[PDB]
Symmetry: C3
């Protein structure tokens, strides 16, 4: 097996091209870069610029006005243990009308791209979710933008259907994001022309095991890269609704160690009453 | 914003004084010291003394007789990874009649103070829990007394309604407990005359977002304080009943990333079948 | 109290011998070695040999063919953060017909031994699970074989009914597995003639508190044992069905900090929709 992280054009997949190769990617790797999906670098930079300005120059009062009273990183600003800004389809917290305009447009484009790629994952695998495709994809997305100051993130897999990641690079050129591919950790660099897609465990679940959910991590630099090692990432989790329903025996056939009585269950039955975005194997 | 941790007299709040200031504390900080609440330092020291004597001089058999067969720190003694002693309203494990007398009185005073302050949090925010105030406050408290030998605790927020903390100081004067206030970690020293209150996430939940649940941590000393760095803390979690019921849309409006189908849910639906006292943002 | 880890012969316990001593072990220690239970060292070595050969010499494609698409360590091979091989009663992933023959026989013998010892734990404590003994023991076992390359595992207790552990030793003689016994960590060495049994929290639960679930950990070597410090362990979790039902008040009497409304609950109500094999006190 080639252990290259492939690139697919969303437009081409939508036209029914590369289906064998897309299926094989999904099963053997569960990650790919995605071009031609409406996500430009120029827009990335307009949303990045305005949030970095807020992180840098927003006063404590401005920051407090867009901070939830529980520090869950669901909505608004989180001073972290890094700085984060989160949003979804509603209940958002925005610093200014300008920020709101730029981030609503950016979110919507990320949501559209994620739905579209998930629709292709389902089609390529012959999967019709219980309740139909479009109700499955009208869901509970979460977008988190994180600034990291000059492992940085422990290995895990995502529990999303898909996760779309747009990064900014380290000024020093260090590549921080890595995933398991072919039994080896492989670099996932920034590309101005593409978004990185990770498949998550709900893809594996809904397709009956036809999609891998790869583990990944964020590495820290060694000696030379203290200097020039800040980076940012825009992480869009496409997450199912609480009432997404699946087959319990089918889940057990593809590695889910469920403790569910009966023949069908929901996402809420499986994960509980709070969303869990990631899981460690360890 | 002043980033001072304020002090309120429970008696004054009960008389309807300082309401604007109490509301603003609750929303912007979610922590305060509480005087005039029936918790003396002299009593703290009588309960502390008898449990420290047990920790120090109790034999393994004495300790085993008050150790639960699962090491959950719910009741009785836990030799930890520190030493802890836990209690609640019933099912307690006591080393001797004297200890029982002193710790039952101490627990009861902590429970009374916690209920009283929670009642003021609810009143100041205009909150009537589903099922009424008094059923909400007749709940599932947990008291944990921890001795720490000469970060010591990772940052988290509490999932209680409120948490009351009485500490003993480091002989060397180091201040170990810190909380986020105004975007900076701030010292929370021992005060002989007051108990520290942290608001927890259930306060945020039940009030519809009018109360912050602050993050906090316990720091370790640097070079000078190896010597004189032991301390103790009495941590009283006021925790809701499993059947405490709340609005799902309201929860989503104030930062809770719930995965709950339908319009109302219980605490058990949200957190699951075992109590979870704390949560990390990370 | 003697703080020796005792040995019992399963055959003798089955004949009704040593009952007082077995009860006292279960309550005060919750761990023992088990002889005369159908688990030989020769068989251990035949299963170990064939899986170590696979770990060493299996190609990435061979490994991929027996890797689940979600990395849960439920079934098949997991390249870890060490290498693991997992199996249960069905849905297994086997590298070759020979491996399948040897590992099916090995699993079955481990399952038989675990059921048998659990049956004695129940009998010695006078326990009839809701729904009867044999339905309780026809359950959801998980076997995990781990190779460790030259703490290595944080302290926890198991959430199984019982856990059977067969190890291979460090070539250098270092003893890595340790458990709390009598308030001190005690060595649990490899024995060619016996399997180690840990009681888990479901034993404590189903018996109404008559069985301790001990904490344990895996230590790393110091200076001399870098060399000769690889080891393996075969860990068999005997885990209840999702619908195992118990008394909520009884659970609270023996240390379980449950958040369960009502008088009875299931294992799924308590732990949720995914199996959780271990728990930290910390
Ligand atoms: Fe991730
Ligand atoms: Fe806390
Ligand atoms: Fe264990």
């Amino acid at each position: 097996m080639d252990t290259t992280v492939p690139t697919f054009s969303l437009a081409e997949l939508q036209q029914g091209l590369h289906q064998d190769e897309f299926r094989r990617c999904l099963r053997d790797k569960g990650l790919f870069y995605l071009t031609d999906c409406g996500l430009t670098d120029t827009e990335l930079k307009s949303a990045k610029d305005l949030v970095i300005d807020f992180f840098e120059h927003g006063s404590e009062a401005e920051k407090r006005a867009v901070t939830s009273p529980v520090p869950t990183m669901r909505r608004g600003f989180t001073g972290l243990e890094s700085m984060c800004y989160s949003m979804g389809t509603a209940d958002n917290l925005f610093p200014s009308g300008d920020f709101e305009r730029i981030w609503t447009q950016y979110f919507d484009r990320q949501y559209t791209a994620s739905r579209a790629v998930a629709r292709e994952v389902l089609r390529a695998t012959g999967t019709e979710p219980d309740g139909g495709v479009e109700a499955f994809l009208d869901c509970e997305p979460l977008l988190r933008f994180r600034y990291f100051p000059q492992l940085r993130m422990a290995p895990h897999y995502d529990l999303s259907m898909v996760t779309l990641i747009q990064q900014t690079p380290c000024a020093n050129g260090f590549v921080s994001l890595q995933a398991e591919v072919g039994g080896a950790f492989t670099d996932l660099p920034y590309r101005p022309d593409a978004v990185l897609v990770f498949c998550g465990a709900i893809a594996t679940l809904v397709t009956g095991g036809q999609v891998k959910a790869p583990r990944h991590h964020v590495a820290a630099p060694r000696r030379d890269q203290i200097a020039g090692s800040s980076r940012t990432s825009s992480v869009f989790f496409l997450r199912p609704n609480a009432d997404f329903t699946f087959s319990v025996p089918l889940a057990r056939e593809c590695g889910f160690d469920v403790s569910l009585d009966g023949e069908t269950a929901t996402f809420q039955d499986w994960i509980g009453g709070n969303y869990v975005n990631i899981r460690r194997t360890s």
